[PDB]
Design a protein around this ligand. Structure first.
Ligand SMILES: [Zn+2]
Lengths: 32, 84, 204, 104, 103, 84
């Protein structure tokens, strides 16, 4: 029964809309 | 307003607009809101890449299929990926 | 001299089509009751089956330009996986309705469910048959009301002639208190101009 | 439960074009040999029995079609209300009419 | 032209299956169609208890279904595919009396 | 677990990929491959009367697949006749 957190605007890995990205070990969307 | 209903038969949400604004899969953009960090993100991402702003945030809830008929819900979005 | 596994296809091909039909009889009974369906058949065509039916009210089965019949036509196709269009149902009509057990039993069942009691319906049915040229009928109604029978004239109930002359039918009625088992039997000794045994004549 | 929209549209279209769905009583794992759908799969992929069974149940419960069961085969048939509702989901116009009306 | 065609008649009822051949041979009066081989009857058999619950004296139903069949391979190529259709039309229409033609 | 496995020396003991010999009877369901992992992984024939969904007392002779009890009701139409 895992829980969830309110979504925040963290995907912005930059400092001025520089789209840096399109976390322990590696992982990709889905399982591959 | 008229044929848009044909299209819905498009996306809404930050997690699904970004995922279609970039990679140039999008179409047209219509901003809104509450916080700049959600206004000057896309707009700046609109600065790179179409970019438009619709007068009201509610009609998006209306134009889109976020209702059941009676309970329109606001929802800013800017990705017309389908555009069939 | 001959191989016994070649003709097995022809033998097995004829048996499958027999069952392919009984399902049709069941389905029609569950659906085209409104037109009082009686019986069906089959005729494997080059690319389809020429099923013909017999229903007292032909008009009810078909619709506007047979529209609902066309509707049914496609349905069967998918169920049996045959090409549509090639399907070609045919519709027939029964003349002496007072000589068939099934239409009478269905009408009687409907009447019973019209709040009218057993006696009036049974006597209406027997009158309808006798006025339609029948030696005799017999109406039996069993359920939560025992068995209350009604009969008019002479019937046979034993021997080979029974299966060909006597025609019987049965139904079930779902009434609030329970189930009303109802059946009917009619004995026509002039069917298809067949001479009943031990029936003789001498002349001058 | 998470039934794809492509399946919804495929079933609606198949129903209206044929006016008749001849379905088998089943509740285990297996796809339907008839209706079909494509989702960037490269080859039209058939639907699953659970999905179509739930969809049919919802539709009939809503009064769009009626059914007989016979033995081992749900036979369905869409009513006038059926033609009046599918055309909306397929996004059709009232002029169009089911195929069977065209001399089967 | 010539195809070494075959005629096969399969059915259950002895009455029609015997009357239909008479019409066929009439139609083949001049095309040389001749006697048919009558195969041994395939008497399928099934037995079952008469009681759904198995009470009382053990009794048994005995139903059987026969499969009469006849073959008119006589035509062979003696007739043309043109009138092989003619062979298949002038014949009466019996509701159930399956038939098939092969070379 | 898609990035794991056992020792190679053990892999030699893998069951022969030769298809299993225990199929399921289909009288006429397309053969296609969470709870889905084991909803009905166990594989076994399910021959049953094609009239009543009952798996008990079914004749397989001549490819009928009819319950013995439900046989009497429809035998008259199916063609079987009671003589001798
Ligand atoms: Zn059964």
């Amino acid at each position: 029964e895992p829980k969830k957190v309110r979504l925040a605007c963290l995907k912005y890995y930059t400092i001025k809309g520089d789209t840096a990205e399109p976390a322990r070990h590696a992982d990709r969307c889905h399982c591959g | 307003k008229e044929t848009f209903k044909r299209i819905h038969n498009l996306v809404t949400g930050h997690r699904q607009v970004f995922k279609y604004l970039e990679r140039k899969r999008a179409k047209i953009c219509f901003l809104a809101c509450e916080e700049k960090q959600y206004a000057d993100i896309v707009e700046c991402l609109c600065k790179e890449y179409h970019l438009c702003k619709k007068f009201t945030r509610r009609t998006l809830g209306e134009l889109t299929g976020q209702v059941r008929c009676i309970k329109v819900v606001p929802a800013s979005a800017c990705v017309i990926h389908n555009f069939v | 001299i001959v191989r016994r596994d070649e003709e097995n296809v022809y033998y097995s091909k004829y048996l499958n089509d027999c069952i392919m039909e009984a399902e049709l009889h069941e389905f029609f009974s569950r659906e085209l009751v409104d037109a009082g369906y009686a019986s069906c058949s089959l005729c494997r065509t080059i690319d389809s089956i020429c099923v013909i039916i017999q229903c007292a009210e032909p008009e009810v089965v078909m619709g506007d330009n047979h529209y609902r019949l066309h509707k049914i036509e496609y349905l069967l196709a998918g169920r049996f996986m045959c090409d549509p269009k090639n399907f070609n149902i045919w519709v027939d009509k029964i003349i002496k309705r007072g000589l068939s057990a099934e239409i009478m039993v269905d009408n009687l069942r409907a009447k019973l469910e019209e709040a009218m009691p057993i006696r009036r319906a049974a006597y209406s049915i027997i009158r309808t048959a006798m006025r339609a040229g029948a030696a005799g009928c017999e109406v039996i109604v069993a359920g939560k009301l025992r068995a209350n029978k009604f009969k008019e004239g002479c019937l046979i109930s034993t021997g080979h002639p029974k299966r060909i002359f006597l025609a019987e039918a049965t139904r079930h009625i779902k009434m609030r208190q329970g189930v009303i088992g109802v059946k009917v039997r009619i004995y026509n000794p002039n069917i298809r101009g067949a001479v009943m045994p031990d029936k003789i004549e001498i002349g001058a | 439960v998470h039934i794809p929209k492509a399946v919804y549209k495929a079933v609606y279209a198949h129903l209206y074009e044929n006016a008749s769905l001849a379905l088998k009583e089943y509740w285990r794992v297996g796809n339907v040999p008839g209706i079909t759908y494509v989702d960037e799969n490269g080859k039209l992929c058939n639907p699953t029995y659970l999905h179509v069974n739930c969809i049919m149940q919802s539709l009939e419960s809503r009064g769009v079609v009626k059914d007989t069961f016979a033995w081992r085969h749900h036979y369905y048939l869409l009513t006038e209300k059926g033609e009046q509702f599918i055309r909306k989901e397929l996004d059709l116009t009232d002029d169009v009419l089911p195929t069977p009306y065209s001399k089967p | 032209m010539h195809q070494k065609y075959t005629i096969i008649v399969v059915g259950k009822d002895l009455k029609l299956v015997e009357r239909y051949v008479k019409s066929i041979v009439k139609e083949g009066r001049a095309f040389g169609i001749s006697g048919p081989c009558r195969a041994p009857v395939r008497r399928l058999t099934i037995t079952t208890r008469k009681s759904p619950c198995g009470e009382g004296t053990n009794t048994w139903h005995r139903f059987e279904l026969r499969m009469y069949k006849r073959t008119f391979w006589v035509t062979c190529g003696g007739n043309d595919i043109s009138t092989i259709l003619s062979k298949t039309v002038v014949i009466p229409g019996i509701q159930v009396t399956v038939e098939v033609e092969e070379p | 677990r898609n990035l794991g496995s056992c020792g190679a020396e053990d892999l030699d003991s893998r069951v022969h990929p030769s298809t299993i010999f225990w199929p399921t009877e289909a009288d006429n369901a397309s053969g296609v491959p969470m709870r889905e992992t084991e909803f009905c992984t166990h594989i076994a024939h399910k021959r049953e009367c094609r009239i009543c969904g009952n798996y008990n007392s079914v004749y397989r002779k001549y490819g009928l697949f009819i319950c013995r009890r439900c046989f009497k009701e429809n035998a008259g139409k199916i063609g079987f006749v009671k003589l001798h």
